[PDB]
Symmetry: C2
Subunit: 333 residues, 2 copies
């Protein structure tokens, strides 16, 4: 155990099919979505119902493609009000042998099912209620199913980590101290990564069990270094989603990643696509002038295009294996 | 048929148990919520699960209290992402004989499950998708159950009827023209009632099938008169919720109502409480200094306190019956 070792509580990952040893995780995609729906999809159920059979078949087929690439584990980052479904994920994992960790947490203020806790917080101690929720889901189970969350998912807004969002960061830090559970995050439009890192550590969370996400959203390597200064891991986890919204191109992403890799940060970098394998609600109807932005936005893009492009640029096999197997065994294992 | 008669399409109300004649509605509470949860409650399902047996017993008991007061119909105004459940409402109606109409629509921008259609609208024709949804739910059924919505529910924000909200007002107006379905609304903090009235009529919706809501939220009688100028009905429908948020006291509400009644607007005024009979999510924990605001916030308050206070102030039995039986038979029947 060389470097920054986590622990001070638990030593194994909790997947939707149960406990798994750090050594069993194999290469991991740390931020993906088996199913995902923007909050409000369930109100469009009349015309956009879930086709369980089509979903299970499509999701298992994508799981099989991943296992063929040697990926043995996926961390499903779906927030509580964005379609999270542990029972479903379990079916997918049982059908294929792909290991899946699910999350506990709500999305950022402007993008999650926010109204509920914003309201409870105006009438009482919402931080304590969010903490009780994260702890029960991480230690006992989600919705009386016995399936436990393997990560706590946090998210902040673009201009600041809002008071609403901080209720979750405080509750999350506490659960992290008490269970050692991993924490992954969402940053909005390439901002707040350093503030996030600072707030979670200042609150006592283990920086070795923290992964600040969507860091590929910023193209100034200075921004990632300031974040890395905290000891936390960062993830370029929207690889393949290019130009959509404020998103950069993978060429801008690989430029910043190779700079950081050449500075010795391999032990702190992770890669994922933030893909959605099956959308909840009605099928998205993507405009013509947007097809390029999502063309490479699927879960086989890193294995097929990215790792080879890195290797051809000078990145070693040991660096690649540290990002894809080394880092997750320690952060989630 | 004297006065402003609706029609030009359909002539009866659609309840969760089926079609009902205008003459069968009896006295009506036009804006209530059998069950309600702020968007995000379903993500708090681990610690705040729905207890169907406790819910059915509590809801049927409240339904029985209403029928004892002679109320035979309730219009459930719950938006699509706020706990709407037609199957449940049907159980309550079947168990008791209370007639219940349910709605189709999403809540105002800052309070509903907004993310989903805000997103679809950035990628395509969300107005058409919302229109298809309202029309199928009003004419065929909600979620493949065969239970149809009897009203379209619309809502706007405080400072303006937002572009997002206008997608729904446009779709609603179209469905209104094609089916004659009634439209009820939500106004936020006593603003936009006139703008609402203006936009729906300018769009061709039938002002005789429009009820602008939460109009008791404003205490300047000039505001209601400008709204009434459009031919639409208005509702003082949060009666009993006092001082909570920007809400006035019932004494301020009755002062504006008696002024309007003394100006001959009885044919255009309706009364309801906007109560919630059973909350979804964890039980609300209401702070001590807030007990007065919700004390009279339940569905028997109008029948027991309000109608008598009006009658003692000079309002006649015919005026009362026009607001509670006359008006709804025409607007929803
Ligand atoms: Co995200
Ligand atoms: Co994500
Ligand atoms: Co309302
Ligand atoms: Co309401």
């Amino acid at each position: 155990s060389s470097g920054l070792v986590p622990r001070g509580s638990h030593m194994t990952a909790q997947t939707v099919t149960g406990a798994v040893a750090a050594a069993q995780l194999g290469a991991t995609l740390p931020h993906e979505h088996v199913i995902f729906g923007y909050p409000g999809y369930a109100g469009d159920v009349t015309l956009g119902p879930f086709d369980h059979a089509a979903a299970l078949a499509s999701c298992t087929e994508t799981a099989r493609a991943l296992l063929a690439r040697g990926i043995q584990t996926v961390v499903d980052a779906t927030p509580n009000g964005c379609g999270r479904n542990p029972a479903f994920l379990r079916e997918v994992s049982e059908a294929t042998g792909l290991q899946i960790l699910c999350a506990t947490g709500f999305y950022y203020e402007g993008g999650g099912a926010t109204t509920y806790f914003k309201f409870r917080a105006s009438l009482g101690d919402a931080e304590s209620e969010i903490y009780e929720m994260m702890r029960t889901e991480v230690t006992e189970g989600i919705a009386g199913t016995g399936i436990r969350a393997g990560v706590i998912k946090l998210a902040s807004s673009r201009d600041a980590i809002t008071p609403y969002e901080q209720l979750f960061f405080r509750a999350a830090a506490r659960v992290q101290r008490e269970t050692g559970v991993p924490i992954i995050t969402h940053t909005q439009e390439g901002q707040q990564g350093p503030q996030q890192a600072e707030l979670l550590t200042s609150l006592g969370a283990d920086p070795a069990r923290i992964m600040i996400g969507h860091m590929d959203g910023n193209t100034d390597p200075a921004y990632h270094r300031e974040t890395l200064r905290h000891g936390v891991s960062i993830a370029f986890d929207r690889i393949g989603l290019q130009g959509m919204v404020g998103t950069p191109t993978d060429a801008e992403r690989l430029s910043v990643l190779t700079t950081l890799l050449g500075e010795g940060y391999a032990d702190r970098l992770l890669l994922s696509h933030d893909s959605i394998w099956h959308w909840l609600g009605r099928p998205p109807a993507i405009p013509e002038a947007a097809l390029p932005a999502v063309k490479d936005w699927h879960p086989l893009h890193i294995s097929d295009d990215i790792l080879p492009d890195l290797r051809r640029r000078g990145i070693t096999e040991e660096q690649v294996g540290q990002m894809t197997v080394g880092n997750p065994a320690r952060l989630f294992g």
